[PDB]
Design an enzyme around this catalytic site. Sequence first.
Site, PDB file in Angstrom:
ATOM      1  N   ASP A 195       0.827  -1.196   0.000  1.00 60.22           N
ATOM      2  CA  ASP A 195       0.000   0.000   0.000  1.00 60.22           C
ATOM      3  C   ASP A 195       0.870   1.259   0.000  1.00 60.22           C
ATOM      4  O   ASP A 195       2.102   1.159   0.056  1.00 60.22           O
ATOM      5  CB  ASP A 195      -0.947  -0.016   1.244  1.00 60.22           C
ATOM      6  CG  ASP A 195      -0.306   0.125   2.617  1.00 60.22           C
ATOM      7  OD1 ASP A 195       0.887   0.537   2.698  1.00 60.22           O
ATOM      8  OD2 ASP A 195      -1.043   0.114   3.601  1.00 60.22           O
ATOM      9  N   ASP A 197       0.965   4.879   2.231  1.00 57.55           N
ATOM     10  CA  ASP A 197       0.457   5.532   3.444  1.00 57.55           C
ATOM     11  C   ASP A 197       0.862   6.961   3.491  1.00 57.55           C
ATOM     12  O   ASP A 197       1.972   7.281   3.099  1.00 57.55           O
ATOM     13  CB  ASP A 197       0.972   4.825   4.723  1.00 57.55           C
ATOM     14  CG  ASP A 197       0.831   3.317   4.730  1.00 57.55           C
ATOM     15  OD1 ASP A 197      -0.305   2.836   4.802  1.00 57.55           O
ATOM     16  OD2 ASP A 197       1.885   2.620   4.673  1.00 57.55           O
ATOM     17  N   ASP A 280      -3.689   4.367   2.539  1.00 57.68           N
ATOM     18  CA  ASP A 280      -4.126   4.724   3.897  1.00 57.68           C
ATOM     19  C   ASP A 280      -3.790   6.172   4.176  1.00 57.68           C
ATOM     20  O   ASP A 280      -2.666   6.603   3.885  1.00 57.68           O
ATOM     21  CB  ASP A 280      -3.489   3.839   4.963  1.00 57.68           C
ATOM     22  CG  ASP A 280      -3.809   2.371   4.802  1.00 57.68           C
ATOM     23  OD1 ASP A 280      -4.911   2.056   4.353  1.00 57.68           O
ATOM     24  OD2 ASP A 280      -2.961   1.545   5.165  1.00 57.68           O
TER      25      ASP A 280
END
Length: 356
Positions: A195, A197, A280
Amino acid sequence: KISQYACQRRTTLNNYNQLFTDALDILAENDELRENEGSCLAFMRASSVLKSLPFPITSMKDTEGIPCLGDKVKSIIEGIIEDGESSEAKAVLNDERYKSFKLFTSVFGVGLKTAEKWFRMGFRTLSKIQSDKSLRFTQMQKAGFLYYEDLVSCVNRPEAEAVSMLVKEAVVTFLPDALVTMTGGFRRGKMTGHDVDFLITSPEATEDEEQQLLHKVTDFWKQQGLLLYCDILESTFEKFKQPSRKDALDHFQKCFLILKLDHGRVHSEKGKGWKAIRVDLVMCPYDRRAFALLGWTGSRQFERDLRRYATHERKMMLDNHALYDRTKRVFLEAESEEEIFAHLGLDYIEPWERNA
Ligand SMILES: Nc1ncnc2c1ncn2[C@@H]1O[C@H](COP(=O)(O)CP(=O)(O)OP(=O)(O)O)[C@@H](O)[C@H]1O
Ligand SMILES: [Co+2]
Ligand SMILES: [Co+2]
Ligand code: NA
């Protein structure tokens, strides 16, 4: 003398002991699955300390003076020196429960409990799970299966930078003074990640403006048809609460997203023309930005040892929101990560040196 604490070690991505640490990481993961927290922690600490070495272990004599290497761990190292393989890690890799848990939890929205449930129902493949007409899936799992191939391929740095541009463009439309920082693995120098962030903070936003930004930014992406998945967790942050004594919980407002990243936005060396990316976002009050940055940069082992060192060695309580001195009975302020390390009496460890 090599410290037992990752926060007193420099751990860079040139790992000379991958043969040993890949085996120890597998054994730690299996202990997590078998709910053996103690054995899991011992394998994680041994793997972490070997990751910090500036040379490869080639004999048992090379392990002298290294902390966190118990008898069980040294037997595993001896076996890898013997024939280049770990018989223990090989048996875990061939275990049916371990294989199923790894495969099922590779789906976004599937954790330990759902993976265990599907295994005890007799499922072994993702094809059999997805095509089952009796199973009921959460909205998170539906997104996990729909965008599976994109999410399992991982994110590279040109993609992470393309996502950073999208985040910054959306955020400054509602808060032009906002500071957006890429955190996690990419801030630690990693080439890939599962991911991307980000930490978002604003020096002049109000309490209400701070609360509404993630809703405004995600509604903007939803209007543009870029929001593939969205889960916003409201803040439970308390300005005057003592930091956690616990793996500390983060009380800041945050969101777990899946964004549609168009290929034209990616400036790399190289189908549908877009890629699903896990993103995120964390919003924190301006005065707590250094504590949040430090907590969101990681690695998980580096954070654990930082908090353990603060408690046991300095009688200080550290978490993503604050630093409290139990002897002076005062909260310690910081405008940067460097100031947090100075409060703790630690030499500053660069983000690319936190790959513990
Ligand atoms: N979904 C999430 N929930 C809670 N904390 C998260 C988070 N994503 C990031 N963080 C925080 O920011 C750091 C990075 O977390 P993760 O995204 O979960 C793994 P990573 O170190 O970034 O490797 P990765 O590049 O493969 O994702 C950790 O210190 C963690 O506490
Ligand atoms: Co990450
Ligand atoms: Co993350
Ligand atoms: Na999962």
